[PDB]
Amino acid sequence: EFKKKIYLVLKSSLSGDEAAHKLLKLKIANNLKKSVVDIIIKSSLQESTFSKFYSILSERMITFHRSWQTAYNETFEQNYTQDIEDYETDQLRILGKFWGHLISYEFLPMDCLKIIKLTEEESCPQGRIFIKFLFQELVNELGL
């Protein structure tokens, strides 16, 4: 029911500002914020492509309060450390562009990339494909 509620908040909004406003007005408890970010990520991964709607939504949540920023920080490291093995190449494309966008504007600090360990043992094809899309977005937005 909580997943449904958040999902319907997303699907009933025209813009990321509206979606962010509705979620913020829910006054979600601090322990549920990470699960809300997880629902937002999974919803964005159901789309056929990336969308600026999710980046704007996340950005407005992050800047509203520090508890949202930390929920996004740990959701990023959660995705790279545990969830990437469950993602197909389409989902990895969307996810890489999403996190690359948030990093490219410092909503997620570039220090979050400290968890990346480019080696033949501590990385997998899912993670390397994810890194590829993330950096591709970084170069497209910022330039070399």
Binding site: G16, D17, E18, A20, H21, L24, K25, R60, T63, F64
Partner: protein, 91 residues
């Protein structure tokens, strides 16, 4: 009716309640300085002459001409001492 410029003129004809919510999502010493220093140095001489003038006038003992003479003498003395000091410093 609007509040702080936000709302609709009226809810009538809008097909909505008109309810407004604040968005939670939005949140070489430049020659001119040397000229001022030189002016201040010459001014100190003229300040001493004026102070002497003030003392002599307040004592109401000397005519305006005698006071002018004593001021010109002090001016000449101090100007000569200054020219000698400038010649020595430049030397």
């Amino acid at each position: 009716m609007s509040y702080n410029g936000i709302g609709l003129k009226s809810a009538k004809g809008s097909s909505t309640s008109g309810h407004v919510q604040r968005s939670l999502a939005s949140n070489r010493p430049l020659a001119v300085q040397k000229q001022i220093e030189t002016h201040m140095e010459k001014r100190e001489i003229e300040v001493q002459v004026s102070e002497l003038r003030d003392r002599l006038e307040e004592e109401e003992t000397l005519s305006e001409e005698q006071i002018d003479k004593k001021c010109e003498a002090l001016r000449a003395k101090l100007t000569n001492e200054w020219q000698e000091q400038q010649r020595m410093s430049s030397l």
